[PDB]
Each structure stands twice: as C-alpha cells, then as structure tokens.
Design a protein around this ligand. Structure first.
Ligand code: CLA
Ligand code: CLA
Ligand code: CLA
Ligand code: CLA
Lengths: 177, 172, 173, 177
C-alpha cells in the first residue's frame, strides 16, 4: 500500500498530470477512450479500447482525497480517474465510476470526484514492470476491473473479485507532455 | 380568463394521456416535430426539431394537466405538460419538454419534470387557421411564446425572447 | 400475374410512393434505411424501425417492362427505390442484393434498369394483401438480426413462406 | 526538385511508411483525420484538423506513381497520400484527392493513387525546419492546400494560388513507429 505507481518510463505518477491509460495487454489496438456501451443509451459513457493501432487513448488525470503524498500517486490507495477533454457530449462528469444498475457493471463516466463511488485503487499486475490493474471495493469486497464485449469493442467492466490477475485488464500509464 | 378545448386536425377536442403528433401548421416542407441534437456540443438532453422528411409524422407526445382535474379535455390557456412517447430513450433524463434556461437561444429541450412549473406551457389559438395553435410559457408575470431558430438539423423550437404555429394530429 | 394490392385493397401503381410495412405481429414500424453493422455507413441496409408510429421510408416501384400499364403485378421483375429529398450516401436509393457478404443483405445503390436489382413480389401465406419478395424467381427475402434490428437479407435456395419476411404496402399521401 | 522531405526528427521520408500529418500552425488541436465535411453526405470523407489536443491524426502512407527514386520522397515531386487504417466506413478508397465538384474544392478521400487526380506536391514552408505545405497542379499553375471552416472543424481545401504561404496550411510529418 506504499509502492508509488510508475508510468511507462518508470517515473512516479503525479496528480494533476495527464496520462494515457493504455492496455499493457494485447497490442493490436490503441488506448482507452470513451464510447457508448450499447444502443440503449448514449450517455453516460463507457470505457473502450480503441481498435485503431496508433490512437493513444483519451487522457485522464488522477485525483487524490487527502494531501498525504503531496502530488504522488501510491498503490493500493483511493484515487479518482477523470478523463481530460475540451469537449464532452454528455451532461454528466468525466470521472470514472461503476454502473450499479448495469447488470454487467460497466465502468462509466459521470461519477462524482469527491464521492466514494468514483473510488478505485491501483494494484501491481503480474510481474511486468510499470504494469498494473485497477480494483474497486464497492461494499468491502475487492474486485478488479476487467473487460467484456461491447458495441464498439472491449469495454471495461467490474469483475466479481480480485482473487487473481487472470481476469484483470492490465494497464500502463503513459505520460502526456 | 378564457379556456376552450384545444382541437386536433380532425377538429376533435384534445384529450390528456392520449398520443398526438405535434406538427407545424403549414404542411409545407418537413414532417412532424422530433427529438434531435441542436448542435455538436451535446447529445443529451435533446432539442425539438422539425424533421425535413415529408412523411415522418413526428414523435408522438402525451399531454398532462398540472393544475386541473376537470374531465379529460385539454383546454387552451391552461398550464399543461408535454411528454414524448417512445418505447426507448437514448438519454439519462425524462421525455418531458422544458426550457433550456441556460442557453442564449432558450431552446426547448427534453428532461423536464412534468410536475414542476419549469415544464408548464399554455396552448393558445394561433392566427386564422382553425385548429392551429402556439405554445406560450410564463417566467411569471408576462408570457413568451415558443418560436424557432435554425439548428444543426433544421428549425429548433426556442422560447422567443411570430410564434411557431402547430397543430395536433391524433395517433391512429 | 394478378395485381399486388395495398392495405386499402387498391392495386399498387408504379412511380407511386408506398410504405413497406412488416405484415406481422407488430413491434415497431415500417422499413427504413439504416446501416447493418459498424463496418460501413454506406451503402445502406433495409431495417425495420422499432418505433411504433414511424411509417417507414417511402419507396416507389419501377418496371423493366413498359407495357403492363402502371400496375405492379405479382411475379413480375420490379425495382424498389427509396424516395427522399436527401441521401447521405454516394450511391442510389434503389434496393439490390449485396452480391457478396454472408447474409446477402439487401442494400441501396442499385440500378433500377439493371437486372441486378430485380425482385419479385408474391403472395404470402393464405392471407389478405400480404406479400414477400423473391430473386428467374427463386430466393425469398427474409430477415436477420443486425445493428439496429431486423435487416432484410436474401435466403438460401428457398422460396417457401417459412423464412420469408411478411410485408404489406401502404399508399402514402 | 531534388531535395528530400524530412519528418519531425529531420529524417528523410520513405514510401510505404506510416506518418502522422500534423498541423504546424497551432497547438490548438491535434492531427489530421477523416471526417465528413457537411450534413449532406457521410461519404466520401474530408480531411479535418481534430480539436482534441493529443489525437495524432490518422496515419497516412506516401506513394509514388513512378518507380524511380526507390522508397525516397522528395519535395516538388508528384506523390499520392493515402490514409492507413484497418477500418473504413466508406466504399471508396483511402486516397486523397480534390473534390472538383464542390465550390470549396475540399480535399476528400476516394481518389485513385495511380491517377493524376490524386497527385500532390510537398514543398517547403516559410519559418521553421521540416515544415511543409502541399500544392496541386491544374496544368501550369500551382494551388496550395489551405483550410476552411467545416462541420467538424478546419477542413482542407485547394486554394486559389500558391503565390505565398499566406493561405497554405503548413504541416510536418511525424513517423509512426
Ligand atoms: C457520446 C457518444 C460517443 C460515442 C458514440 C463514441 C464512440 C467512439 N469513440 Mg469516443 N468520445 C466521446 C463520446 C463518444 N464516443 C467523447 C465525449 C469524447 C471526448 C471528446 C471522446 C473521445 C474519443 C477518443 C480520443 C477516441 C474515441 C474513439 C471512439 C470510437 C472507438 C471504437 C473504435 O475504435 O472504432 C474504430 C473507429 C471507427 C469506426 C471510426 C470512428 C469515427 C467516429 C469519430 C465517428 C463515427 C460517426 C458516425 C456517428 C458513425 C456511427 C454510426 C452508428 C449507426 C454506429 C467509437 C466510434 C476512438 C477512435 O477510434 O476515434 C476515431 C478514439 O481514439 N473517442
Ligand atoms: C441521442 C441523440 C439523438 C439525435 C442525435 C437525434 C437526431 C435526429 N433525429 Mg431524433 N430521436 C432520439 C434521439 C436523437 N435523435 C430519441 C431518443 C428518439 C425517440 C426514440 C428519437 C426519435 C426521432 C424520430 C421519431 C425522428 C427523429 C429524427 C431525427 C433527425 C431529424 C433531422 C432530419 O429531419 O434529418 C433528415 C434525415 C436524415 C439526414 C437521415 C437520418 C440519419 C440518422 C438516422 C443518423 C445520422 C447519423 C450519422 C451516421 C452520423 C452523422 C452525425 C452528424 C451530426 C454529423 C435527426 C438526425 C427524424 C428523422 O428524420 O429520422 C430519420 C424523425 O422522424 N428522431
Ligand atoms: C447513413 C447512415 C444511416 C444510418 C446509420 C441510419 C440509421 C437509422 N435510421 Mg435511417 N436513413 C438514412 C441513413 C441512415 N440511417 C437516410 C439517408 C435516410 C433517408 C433520408 C434515412 C431515413 C430513415 C427513416 C424514415 C427512418 C430511419 C430510421 C433509422 C433508425 C432505425 C432503428 C430504430 O428504429 O431506432 C429507433 C430510434 C432510436 C434508437 C433513436 C435514433 C435516432 C436517430 C435519428 C439518430 C441517432 C443518432 C446517434 C447520435 C447515433 C450514434 C450511434 C452510436 C452507436 C455511434 C436508425 C438509427 C427510423 C427511425 O426510427 O428514426 C428515428 C425511421 O423511421 N431512417
Ligand atoms: C463515416 C463518417 C465519419 C465521420 C462522421 C467522422 C467524424 C469525425 N472524426 Mg473520423 N474517421 C472515419 C470516418 C468518419 N469520421 C474513418 C473511416 C476513420 C478511419 C477508421 C476515422 C478516423 C478518425 C480518427 C483517428 C480521428 C477521427 C476524428 C473525428 C472527429 C473530428 C472532429 C473533432 O475533433 O471532434 C472532437 C471530438 C468530439 C466531438 C467527440 C468525438 C465523438 C465521436 C467519437 C462520435 C461522434 C458521433 C456522435 C454519436 C454523433 C454526433 C453528435 C454531436 C452532438 C456531436 C469527427 C467526430 C478525431 C476524433 O476527435 O476522434 C474522437 C480523430 O482523432 N476520425
């Protein structure tokens, strides 16, 4: 719970800083971007892995509840992920959160920055360096963020647990300058 | 006062909780009024636009009467609420018309509370044409009528800061 | 070769706007242009709208033969073309079978004068003014689940009204 | 002419090589991408400067009609530009050409890289290193590629002249590793 998260260059992640959250896994597409999960709703937005190979993803900024790391972002700690964008087609926030009414638990936008529903934790994934997985604790239980088939491709969804990395969607943080 | 029954294209009095297409008075170009984005900055909520396809009737609405319980006739000059009727909705808000108070155009949009003063309009006779009306809203004192402006897909209803004449066509 | 009839029992005339509407148990409305998948926006497929009161997009009918008056008779090569004041794709509003793909989607952009877009309208079941499309005449037009909903597709080597998409024509005015 | 076109790293451009064609005028946006120019047609596609800050643009590969200078690309020489993508929503080709039928003379996709109607010329552009501009040839006169306001943003159009860089949309080429 004390090992600071690092970007693709091995440097410590910092808040108020832009990063591309890119799949560490299957290198046959691009980064994570907003997109609707299905044709039932266009808002709020889900999180997909773009199929276009050199599209980096839409940048995010990592926020922190209590000044206890100055600007640093530590592992197994409460953080909030917010897409950074000059344009937003939905009347809700860009902060990540979970769709509880979704009977599939898609990771969606619209979450509240300071609220606890938008809380996620970054854990080390497997053994690759600077590689991680995301995990949320809805009501005490720990579940890792995975992915599932959606309209536009694989969309981030909450798994039933965090017992093993097997179902986790591995990610890396690439600094945007 | 003055409060007479609003009538549909067949001259029949309007009934609450009944589907009607709201269509522009003159059957010139386009079809009925439908939900559509007004610009490229937002998908939701939705504006009210006249479709340019000539045989599209428009998306039906139901009318509810806020301040009244007096039979099932909709009357002119009486607060009423307008709600689109559809089996599906792509936005995370209601199908009720209201005013986009915070837009320099005062677009009429979806997502209002059918029981809040925000979503109340009054139907008044328009010009000569029989069974022709206009929608009017009161910020409270003085009333402004619903007109239109050009938007992404076509004319979009806006609160006039002439009115956009409409008629009601019973569904089926 | 008896006349195809609309919902009023009137025979269809060529170059007259008609709504093609699903002659079956009714969840949705008429046939309209829509994209079949996320791989292409153009050309367009034929999809049944899920909205209750959407008539469908209008279509006109044309005949390769020019000696049967203006009557659109059953079992006679005809060309179905969407009628609209605007079109967002480079090709034609005429229906045709996507020669190549799996489900042989019926698509837009055909040549009303080419035999590539000729269809046949024939009686469907022992009903009233209910038909189907076939393609001299042998493959029946059925449907299959697509992006927006049922999309028209040509069926394999069969015409029996078991896997055919039931339709009625409603005159527009 | 004989001089080589250089990418952002000052290296010579090569054929069959993916590059991002990025605007050199501002930092108020991202690279060049396919987008429809107006609501009248979805296909073919125009070339628009995306407003999203970190979108690099959709890669393009450069081709030479002639089988002369191997895989080299030199200024003042005839070349065709073609988008590179595993997905394409329009029937037509990914090759750039001029829409001679529009009053705006929008640069659109669907051209024939082998036909002279898709050929363009990369020439130097005023201030800054490795900065260029594109010019097309009517017959005897050159017309630089500029841009005009379109539905989704600045769209490339064929200018009137090439008397100055004044109305030319400057670009640079960034190799897509
Ligand atoms: C509100 C609805 C919404 C929807 C529908 C989408 C949908 C999509 N976005 Mg997201 N996005 C949104 C809001 C939305 N976005 C917002 C508010 C932002 C902040 C501005 C972004 C930022 C963003 C980024 C940074 C990226 C995406 C990308 C994508 C695409 C990912 C799948 C893919 O790789 O296909 C492969 C790609 C294609 C088939 C070409 C897509 C062309 C798009 C731009 C327009 C399509 C137009 C038209 C409506 C076609 C759909 C028809 C419909 C019937 C299916 C997908 C089309 C990624 C992408 O690939 O963009 C091009 C990407 O890199 N989006
Ligand atoms: C979520 C956002 C949303 C948006 C973007 C729209 C947008 C639109 N709607 Mg509304 N609608 C919505 C939600 C939405 N709708 C909901 C929730 C309902 C209830 C279920 C409806 C019910 C509805 C009806 C009943 C009707 C409309 C119609 C229309 C069109 C009116 C303008 C016109 O006449 O063009 C003329 C038509 C065209 C140019 C062809 C239509 C093309 C559409 C289907 C797709 C465009 C997407 C394209 C691939 C990407 C380009 C996007 C552009 C901004 C660059 C316009 C495209 C009218 C229409 O004509 O529909 C076809 C109409 O009759 N809508
Ligand atoms: C070029 C691409 C294209 C595409 C993708 C579509 C797609 C669609 N059309 Mg078709 N259409 C087109 C061209 C196109 N059209 C042309 C050129 C014409 C002639 C002008 C028409 C005429 C037409 C008619 C007359 C009708 C359709 C309708 C429909 C809808 C049928 C499914 C349904 O019942 O949902 C029900 C409706 C909804 C789920 C809400 C959708 C509202 C539409 C208007 C806009 C959606 C925009 C949204 C932001 C797209 C993003 C998707 C995301 C995955 C990227 C579907 C959305 C039917 C319809 O229901 O229209 C509303 C209908 O009646 N279209
Ligand atoms: C077929 C029609 C088509 C159309 C309509 C577009 C349209 C667009 N493309 Mg292009 N594109 C296409 C085909 C198409 N594309 C193809 C075949 C490819 C190769 C696969 C691409 C590859 C591509 C790339 C690589 C990129 C684009 C981008 C964009 C956007 C640039 C403007 C901008 O900066 O907005 C700023 C962004 C927004 C307003 C939010 C993005 C919304 C997108 C994802 C969906 C829009 C559909 C929406 C439901 C309907 C409109 C609603 C209205 C209220 C806005 C614009 C939305 C750029 C972009 O910004 O992508 C996200 C970009 O980087 N496109």
């Amino acid at each position: 719970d004390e090992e600071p998260v690092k970007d693709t260059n091995g440097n410590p992640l910092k808040i108020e800083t832009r990063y591309f959250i890119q799949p560490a896994s299957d290198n046959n597409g691009g980064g994570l971007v907003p997109a609707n999960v299905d044709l039932s709703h266009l808002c709020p937005l889900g999180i997909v892995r773009t199929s276009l190979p050199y599209q980096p993803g839409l940048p995010v900024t990592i926020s922190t509840p209590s000044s206890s790391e100055g600007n640093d972002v530590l592992t197994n700690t409460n953080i909030a992920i917010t897409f950074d964008a000059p344009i937003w087609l939905c009347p809700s926030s860009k902060t990540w959160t979970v769709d509880s009414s979704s009977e599939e638990k898609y990771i969606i936008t619209g979450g509240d920055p300071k609220s606890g529903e938008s809380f996620f934790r970054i854990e080390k994934y497997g053994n690759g360096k600077n590689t991680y997985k995301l995990v949320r604790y809805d009501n005490g239980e720990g579940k890792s963020v995975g992915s599932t088939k959606s309209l536009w491709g694989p969309a981030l969804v909450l798994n039933d647990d965090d017992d093993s990395d097997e179902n986790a969607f591995p990610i890396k943080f690439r600094e945007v300058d």
